Amino acid sequence: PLAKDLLHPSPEEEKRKHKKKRLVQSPNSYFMDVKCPGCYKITTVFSHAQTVVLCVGCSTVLCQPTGGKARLTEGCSFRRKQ
Amino acid sequence: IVKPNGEKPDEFESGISQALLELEMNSDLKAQLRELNITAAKEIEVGGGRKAIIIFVPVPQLKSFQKIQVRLVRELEKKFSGKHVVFIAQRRILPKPTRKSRTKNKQKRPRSRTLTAVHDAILEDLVFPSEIVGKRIRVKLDGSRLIKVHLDKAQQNNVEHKVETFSGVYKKLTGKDVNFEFPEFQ
Amino acid sequence: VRMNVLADALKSINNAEKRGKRQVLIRPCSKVIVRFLTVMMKHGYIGEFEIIDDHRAGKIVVNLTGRLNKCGVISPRFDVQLKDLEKWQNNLLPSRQFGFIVLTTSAGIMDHEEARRKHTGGKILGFFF
Amino acid sequence: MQNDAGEFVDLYVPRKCSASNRIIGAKDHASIQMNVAEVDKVTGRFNGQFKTYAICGAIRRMGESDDSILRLAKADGIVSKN
Amino acid sequence: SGALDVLQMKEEDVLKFLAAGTHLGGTNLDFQMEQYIYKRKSDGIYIINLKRTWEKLLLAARAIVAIENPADVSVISSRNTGQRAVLKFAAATGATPIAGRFTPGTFTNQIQAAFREPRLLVVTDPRADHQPLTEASYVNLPTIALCNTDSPLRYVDIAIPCNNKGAHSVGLMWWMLAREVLRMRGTISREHPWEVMPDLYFYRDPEEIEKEE
Amino acid sequence: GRMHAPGKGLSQSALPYRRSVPTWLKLTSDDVKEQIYKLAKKGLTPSQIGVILRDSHGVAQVRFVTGNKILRILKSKGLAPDLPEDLYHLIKKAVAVRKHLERNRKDKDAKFRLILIESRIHRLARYYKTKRVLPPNWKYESSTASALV
RNA sequence: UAAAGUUGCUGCAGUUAAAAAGCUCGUAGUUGGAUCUCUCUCGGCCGAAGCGUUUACUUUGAAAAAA
């Protein structure tokens, strides 16, 4: 240490750090589009969702809230955006 | 068909409006420029043998313009050879109120009409397709500042040529040196 | 809680200078912090610094040349007059040959020498030597 | 070190640490003066000239003397970039 | 190295490094030696970046070469693993060896039998040669050390990141340091392979000797 | 640290640097405003409105889409409760604690926590009265805590 | 009175030498994060006009017995 460059940290070091402790803070979360076999239209699900997102096209739940990341259901494909 | 804000149309301003008046008909946006009106247009030298053209759009229409500006700009650069075309809004800066004052503005100055907010909005309109993902201000030993701007990495090779004109336009409008870069880290 | 962010900035710079580091991260940034850093830089004590802009309150990465013995704040910001300025530089500065007291005056933020040249007192922010 | 007439009145000018740019005292017996030999560009042999780095005792004690000398050599063209 | 092609690290040196196990560190990492490793394996062993090892070895060779009097360089080894490797080094380069117990007071007690004033100090293990390292902080004595991943860097000015546990690795490191010092000095050439074989510097336990005869 | 606890946690949201409407979000500002109105009609607080919009429909931040805040939008149309959400929830917690303490007079920890909750209610009430969000005669009374809600 | 930095604003002390309340809440008190760059006074440089947006500060200017 003693000469660490704080203006240009490595992306690995930035990702390792706490979200609020980074040089410029960014969320660890993301939004996803989920494809369900019982539907065809796009529904955007937050990765850390707190509600039981429901499939409009069927009677299946889309994800279950957890302490952290939501528990995506089996058979529905999630694709993160951005 | 322009509505100049300064009540004093110029030759190049009238010329730009005529080019727009054309587009309006012979184009794909008859359902666009109809109301998409501008207010002014300048042509400034950015450095060396190149120049650039700045189209001053009124604020409430900017979003509409921004919906089609990328399509519009591509044509105007075609219509003007090697001259980049930039859309920034006519944002007015109210002077900071002082104890020694006059009947300048009896009401509180809105934050959108402060110098810093207007300058930041000018920087954001200067680069419409590429977004601002990070800003730095390096205060150099002589006390002179230098703004370094990080842009989107996905639009890197399409706008890297537009550098040296964005800096020129910003230096003409706000009087601050600015640089643009594209960091590896997203 | 956190009050007088300039005290935090100057203490961070002082601690990083005592440890021999080459850069220090000051956060939050402020207008008074930037003016104090500019005054310290014009005299060669601090060198270059860059303001990281996050959309809430910026940070500053300050390069450190090892010329700084101590940078401190004076709290509360006593309103010092010109006639009382000399006493202050007797209490805070090592000698009359170097070291500066930073004041904020109606003409801006500047060292004690420039305040004397401009003939204006003010409020003492801090000192550095 | 100079009076009004411009005469140097200091007994001597002390060394400054090559890393911290801090004065090395007259009784800092842990401080060192490393000489690193320069090398010919085509033969890789000793030219007879060297480059010197003065390191204070505190940096040696903290264990940051190695990184200090490595940084000085890297910035001095003796250790290759990366 | 100085980015010169002549001083770059060659194929045979890399093969010797891999054969001796020099690239293999320990299961613990000193935070001062974090810049010299490349990655930690699945079994917790840290891999030492051999390029950084070559750079630090050449820096140490330059520091040794700058010392005009070759005897003013003192090479120490208290562990048996590096004793013979030290004794060969002193013979190859002209340095002064201390293999075995370092009697305290060697550097700081003027009125003593083996009181010496080296201008450079080279050790095999900062953990096992802590006495000369601590003593070098009294006489303005710069230090070169062969450091593992968990080796402390107090009073170590040029740390050479290498496996200093295995006998093969220690012998190879001392042999390469001697070879580079000689090549820099002018004696022996860098165009033809050195006549001295690395196994000369290797430590041989009495069990292997009793096996040989 | 916490106002009434010894803990000092770092948990909170980290807004991204960008302030632009996301690429995936196709909803217009008026569409989001109508969604907010419908959710408020369903009987949801601005916190729940923001949570539901972020989870299912998908908005990074409604302030970036509509340009306004959820409570500001609700007030502009006019759907906001008489008393703010946080104060209402604090009063609800105080009412629950008092109701428990009626049948649990031995509970000397519920009494301490009720003192803490009432202190938080009084601080919030003073702040809101300062900002003219509450009548200057607004007061929290144990006899009227549940009776007002 | 200084010495007394043994009254400490400058400028003390509170683990064991004298000392932090058993603990928490709480009013007055103290302290409070970024952030905002149709006035120039009459004959085509010439008497009139004041919540000129209060303050603190700071720098002038008057008015302030002598001893």
mmCIF file of N, CA and C in Angstrom, chain F residues 53-116:
data_model
loop_
_atom_site.group_PDB
_atom_site.id
_atom_site.type_symbol
_atom_site.label_atom_id
_atom_site.label_comp_id
_atom_site.label_asym_id
_atom_site.label_seq_id
_atom_site.Cartn_x
_atom_site.Cartn_y
_atom_site.Cartn_z
ATOM 1 N N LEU F 53 -44.435 -0.852 -8.010
ATOM 2 C CA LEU F 53 -43.998 -0.390 -9.324
ATOM 3 C C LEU F 53 -42.601 -0.900 -9.649
ATOM 4 N N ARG F 54 -41.713 -0.929 -8.654
ATOM 5 C CA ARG F 54 -40.358 -1.413 -8.884
ATOM 6 C C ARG F 54 -40.326 -2.914 -9.128
ATOM 7 N N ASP F 55 -41.221 -3.667 -8.487
ATOM 8 C CA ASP F 55 -41.145 -5.123 -8.543
ATOM 9 C C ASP F 55 -41.782 -5.680 -9.811
ATOM 10 N N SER F 56 -43.066 -5.389 -10.029
ATOM 11 C CA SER F 56 -43.839 -6.064 -11.068
ATOM 12 C C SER F 56 -43.809 -5.315 -12.398
ATOM 13 N N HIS F 57 -44.278 -4.067 -12.409
ATOM 14 C CA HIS F 57 -44.286 -3.304 -13.652
ATOM 15 C C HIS F 57 -42.871 -2.950 -14.083
ATOM 16 N N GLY F 58 -42.062 -2.475 -13.148
ATOM 17 C CA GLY F 58 -40.652 -2.249 -13.367
ATOM 18 C C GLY F 58 -40.354 -0.796 -13.649
ATOM 19 N N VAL F 59 -39.989 -0.055 -12.608
ATOM 20 C CA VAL F 59 -39.490 1.308 -12.733
ATOM 21 C C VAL F 59 -38.311 1.441 -11.784
ATOM 22 N N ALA F 60 -37.180 1.911 -12.306
ATOM 23 C CA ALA F 60 -36.017 2.132 -11.458
ATOM 24 C C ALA F 60 -36.340 3.132 -10.356
ATOM 25 N N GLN F 61 -36.901 4.273 -10.739
ATOM 26 C CA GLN F 61 -37.357 5.289 -9.803
ATOM 27 C C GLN F 61 -38.413 6.121 -10.507
ATOM 28 N N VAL F 62 -39.611 6.171 -9.924
ATOM 29 C CA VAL F 62 -40.711 6.902 -10.538
ATOM 30 C C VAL F 62 -40.410 8.393 -10.632
ATOM 31 N N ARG F 63 -39.560 8.920 -9.748
ATOM 32 C CA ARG F 63 -39.167 10.321 -9.855
ATOM 33 C C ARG F 63 -38.453 10.598 -11.167
ATOM 34 N N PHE F 64 -37.703 9.624 -11.677
ATOM 35 C CA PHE F 64 -37.008 9.807 -12.943
ATOM 36 C C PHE F 64 -37.943 9.674 -14.136
ATOM 37 N N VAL F 65 -39.037 8.929 -13.990
ATOM 38 C CA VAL F 65 -39.987 8.771 -15.087
ATOM 39 C C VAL F 65 -40.939 9.957 -15.148
ATOM 40 N N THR F 66 -41.705 10.169 -14.080
ATOM 41 C CA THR F 66 -42.726 11.207 -14.065
ATOM 42 C C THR F 66 -42.169 12.591 -13.764
ATOM 43 N N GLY F 67 -40.946 12.682 -13.247
ATOM 44 C CA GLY F 67 -40.397 13.948 -12.816
ATOM 45 C C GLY F 67 -40.832 14.395 -11.441
ATOM 46 N N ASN F 68 -41.789 13.707 -10.826
ATOM 47 C CA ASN F 68 -42.315 14.046 -9.515
ATOM 48 C C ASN F 68 -42.187 12.845 -8.588
ATOM 49 N N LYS F 69 -42.424 13.086 -7.305
ATOM 50 C CA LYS F 69 -42.400 12.028 -6.310
ATOM 51 C C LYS F 69 -43.807 11.483 -6.093
ATOM 52 N N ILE F 70 -43.877 10.285 -5.506
ATOM 53 C CA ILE F 70 -45.155 9.582 -5.393
ATOM 54 C C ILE F 70 -46.130 10.373 -4.533
ATOM 55 N N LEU F 71 -45.676 10.824 -3.363
ATOM 56 C CA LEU F 71 -46.541 11.619 -2.500
ATOM 57 C C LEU F 71 -46.906 12.936 -3.166
ATOM 58 N N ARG F 72 -45.961 13.528 -3.896
ATOM 59 C CA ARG F 72 -46.239 14.759 -4.623
ATOM 60 C C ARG F 72 -47.300 14.541 -5.695
ATOM 61 N N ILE F 73 -47.219 13.424 -6.421
ATOM 62 C CA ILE F 73 -48.226 13.107 -7.431
ATOM 63 C C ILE F 73 -49.589 12.917 -6.777
ATOM 64 N N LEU F 74 -49.623 12.150 -5.684
ATOM 65 C CA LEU F 74 -50.881 11.890 -4.993
ATOM 66 C C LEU F 74 -51.504 13.180 -4.486
ATOM 67 N N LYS F 75 -50.686 14.080 -3.938
ATOM 68 C CA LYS F 75 -51.199 15.365 -3.481
ATOM 69 C C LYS F 75 -51.678 16.218 -4.648
ATOM 70 N N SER F 76 -50.963 16.179 -5.774
ATOM 71 C CA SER F 76 -51.364 16.963 -6.938
ATOM 72 C C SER F 76 -52.751 16.558 -7.415
ATOM 73 N N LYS F 77 -52.999 15.253 -7.538
ATOM 74 C CA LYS F 77 -54.366 14.818 -7.814
ATOM 75 C C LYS F 77 -55.246 14.977 -6.583
ATOM 76 N N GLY F 78 -54.718 14.608 -5.426
ATOM 77 C CA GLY F 78 -55.383 14.656 -4.140
ATOM 78 C C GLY F 78 -55.855 13.271 -3.764
ATOM 79 N N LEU F 79 -54.968 12.519 -3.109
ATOM 80 C CA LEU F 79 -55.332 11.235 -2.520
ATOM 81 C C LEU F 79 -54.563 10.977 -1.231
ATOM 82 N N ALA F 80 -53.734 11.911 -0.776
ATOM 83 C CA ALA F 80 -52.859 11.654 0.351
ATOM 84 C C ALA F 80 -53.656 11.635 1.654
ATOM 85 N N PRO F 81 -53.247 10.813 2.615
ATOM 86 C CA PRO F 81 -53.936 10.785 3.908
ATOM 87 C C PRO F 81 -53.761 12.100 4.651
ATOM 88 N N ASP F 82 -54.607 12.285 5.667
ATOM 89 C CA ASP F 82 -54.537 13.500 6.472
ATOM 90 C C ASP F 82 -53.201 13.607 7.190
ATOM 91 N N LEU F 83 -52.691 12.491 7.693
ATOM 92 C CA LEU F 83 -51.408 12.460 8.365
ATOM 93 C C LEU F 83 -50.416 11.619 7.570
ATOM 94 N N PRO F 84 -49.138 11.990 7.573
ATOM 95 C CA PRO F 84 -48.166 11.307 6.714
ATOM 96 C C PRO F 84 -47.990 9.842 7.086
ATOM 97 N N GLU F 85 -47.403 9.096 6.147
ATOM 98 C CA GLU F 85 -47.323 7.645 6.273
ATOM 99 C C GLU F 85 -46.495 7.226 7.481
ATOM 100 N N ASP F 86 -45.312 7.822 7.649
ATOM 101 C CA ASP F 86 -44.433 7.413 8.742
ATOM 102 C C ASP F 86 -45.054 7.712 10.099
ATOM 103 N N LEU F 87 -45.656 8.894 10.250
ATOM 104 C CA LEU F 87 -46.322 9.230 11.501
ATOM 105 C C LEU F 87 -47.488 8.292 11.771
ATOM 106 N N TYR F 88 -48.255 7.960 10.732
ATOM 107 C CA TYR F 88 -49.376 7.043 10.900
ATOM 108 C C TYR F 88 -48.900 5.666 11.347
ATOM 109 N N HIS F 89 -47.809 5.173 10.758
ATOM 110 C CA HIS F 89 -47.294 3.861 11.139
ATOM 111 C C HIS F 89 -46.737 3.874 12.557
ATOM 112 N N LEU F 90 -46.079 4.967 12.944
ATOM 113 C CA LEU F 90 -45.598 5.093 14.316
ATOM 114 C C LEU F 90 -46.758 5.089 15.303
ATOM 115 N N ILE F 91 -47.833 5.809 14.980
ATOM 116 C CA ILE F 91 -48.997 5.850 15.860
ATOM 117 C C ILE F 91 -49.660 4.482 15.931
ATOM 118 N N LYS F 92 -49.698 3.761 14.809
ATOM 119 C CA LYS F 92 -50.251 2.411 14.811
ATOM 120 C C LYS F 92 -49.444 1.487 15.712
ATOM 121 N N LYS F 93 -48.115 1.577 15.642
ATOM 122 C CA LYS F 93 -47.274 0.759 16.510
ATOM 123 C C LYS F 93 -47.477 1.122 17.976
ATOM 124 N N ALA F 94 -47.609 2.417 18.273
ATOM 125 C CA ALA F 94 -47.873 2.834 19.647
ATOM 126 C C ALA F 94 -49.207 2.295 20.143
ATOM 127 N N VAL F 95 -50.232 2.325 19.290
ATOM 128 C CA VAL F 95 -51.542 1.806 19.672
ATOM 129 C C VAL F 95 -51.461 0.313 19.949
ATOM 130 N N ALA F 96 -50.745 -0.425 19.097
ATOM 131 C CA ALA F 96 -50.585 -1.859 19.321
ATOM 132 C C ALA F 96 -49.865 -2.135 20.633
ATOM 133 N N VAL F 97 -48.814 -1.369 20.924
ATOM 134 C CA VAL F 97 -48.073 -1.572 22.164
ATOM 135 C C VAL F 97 -48.952 -1.282 23.373
ATOM 136 N N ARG F 98 -49.742 -0.205 23.322
ATOM 137 C CA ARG F 98 -50.627 0.113 24.442
ATOM 138 C C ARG F 98 -51.693 -0.961 24.633
ATOM 139 N N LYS F 99 -52.259 -1.458 23.533
ATOM 140 C CA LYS F 99 -53.254 -2.518 23.628
ATOM 141 C C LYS F 99 -52.655 -3.776 24.241
ATOM 142 N N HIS F 100 -51.419 -4.113 23.864
ATOM 143 C CA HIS F 100 -50.740 -5.241 24.494
ATOM 144 C C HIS F 100 -50.492 -4.982 25.974
ATOM 145 N N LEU F 101 -50.074 -3.763 26.318
ATOM 146 C CA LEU F 101 -49.759 -3.430 27.700
ATOM 147 C C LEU F 101 -50.988 -3.431 28.593
ATOM 148 N N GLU F 102 -52.179 -3.266 28.019
ATOM 149 C CA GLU F 102 -53.393 -3.359 28.825
ATOM 150 C C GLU F 102 -53.518 -4.733 29.472
ATOM 151 N N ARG F 103 -53.286 -5.792 28.702
ATOM 152 C CA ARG F 103 -53.387 -7.152 29.212
ATOM 153 C C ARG F 103 -52.056 -7.706 29.703
ATOM 154 N N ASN F 104 -50.989 -6.917 29.650
ATOM 155 C CA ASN F 104 -49.650 -7.364 30.019
ATOM 156 C C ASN F 104 -48.978 -6.321 30.902
ATOM 157 N N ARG F 105 -49.677 -5.904 31.963
ATOM 158 C CA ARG F 105 -49.159 -4.855 32.839
ATOM 159 C C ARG F 105 -47.791 -5.211 33.413
ATOM 160 N N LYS F 106 -47.495 -6.503 33.559
ATOM 161 C CA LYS F 106 -46.184 -6.929 34.038
ATOM 162 C C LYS F 106 -45.064 -6.643 33.048
ATOM 163 N N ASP F 107 -45.383 -6.445 31.774
ATOM 164 C CA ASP F 107 -44.361 -6.287 30.743
ATOM 165 C C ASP F 107 -43.706 -4.923 30.905
ATOM 166 N N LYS F 108 -42.554 -4.896 31.573
ATOM 167 C CA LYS F 108 -41.817 -3.657 31.769
ATOM 168 C C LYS F 108 -40.913 -3.312 30.595
ATOM 169 N N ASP F 109 -40.734 -4.226 29.644
ATOM 170 C CA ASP F 109 -40.007 -3.917 28.420
ATOM 171 C C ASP F 109 -40.901 -3.284 27.367
ATOM 172 N N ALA F 110 -42.164 -3.710 27.295
ATOM 173 C CA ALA F 110 -43.113 -3.054 26.407
ATOM 174 C C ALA F 110 -43.329 -1.606 26.810
ATOM 175 N N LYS F 111 -43.297 -1.312 28.110
ATOM 176 C CA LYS F 111 -43.433 0.065 28.572
ATOM 177 C C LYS F 111 -42.257 0.924 28.112
ATOM 178 N N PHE F 112 -41.040 0.387 28.207
ATOM 179 C CA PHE F 112 -39.855 1.097 27.732
ATOM 180 C C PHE F 112 -39.927 1.338 26.228
ATOM 181 N N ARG F 113 -40.310 0.306 25.475
ATOM 182 C CA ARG F 113 -40.428 0.464 24.031
ATOM 183 C C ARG F 113 -41.539 1.439 23.666
ATOM 184 N N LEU F 114 -42.618 1.473 24.449
ATOM 185 C CA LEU F 114 -43.683 2.439 24.214
ATOM 186 C C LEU F 114 -43.196 3.857 24.453
ATOM 187 N N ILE F 115 -42.371 4.055 25.482
ATOM 188 C CA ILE F 115 -41.770 5.367 25.698
ATOM 189 C C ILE F 115 -40.935 5.771 24.489
ATOM 190 N N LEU F 116 -40.139 4.839 23.962
ATOM 191 C CA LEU F 116 -39.330 5.145 22.780
ATOM 192 C C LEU F 116 -40.204 5.501 21.579
#
